[PDB]
Amino acid sequence: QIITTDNTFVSGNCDVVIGIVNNTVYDPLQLE
Amino acid sequence: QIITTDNTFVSGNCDVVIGIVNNTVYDPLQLE
Numbered sequence: 001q002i003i004t005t006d007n008t009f010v011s012g013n014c015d016v017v018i019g020i021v022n023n024t025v026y027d028p029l030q031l032e
Numbered sequence: 033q034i035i036t037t038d039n040t041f042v043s044g045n046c047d048v049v050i051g052i053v054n055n056t057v058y059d060p061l062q063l064e
């Protein structure tokens with residue numbers, strides 16, 4: 001599935017998770 | 033409860049599920 005803000009819950013600062021990867025998540029709110 | 037896009041998740045093509053029923057779902061984003 002396309003990784004949207006409904007599929008995922010966000011909590012962190014992108015410096016503590018070992019193995020995190022760079023990608024763009026999608027939001028259904030900005031478009032509307 | 034009123035069938036909204038958060039109560040349900042969408043995945044399919046309306047042609048493979050046996051017993052599907054025509055109805056309208058609701059989304060809280062189009063109004064806003």
Ligand SMILES: *[C@@H]1O[C@H](CO)[C@@H](O[C@@H]2O[C@H](CO)[C@@H](O)[C@H](O)[C@@H]2O)[C@H](O)[C@H]1NC(C)=O
Binds near residue numbers: 020021022
């Ligand atoms: C994911 O993307 C980040 C920015 O969108 C990257 O941060 C950068 O990190 C470099 C050094 O790695 C800095 O020079 C730069 O200023 C910025 O902070 C991040 O590195 C990147 N990580 C991966 C794994 O792609």
Ligand SMILES: *[C@@H]1O[C@H](CO)[C@@H](O[C@@H]2O[C@H](CO)[C@@H](O)[C@H](O)[C@@H]2O)[C@H](O)[C@H]1NC(C)=O
Binds near residue numbers: 054
């Ligand atoms: C649910 O609603 C669909 C359209 O909103 C219906 O599709 C139609 O199917 C007929 C043939 O039955 C076509 O002639 C028409 O062009 C349209 O594609 C669908 O049938 C309907 N299903 C039920 C169970 O009511």
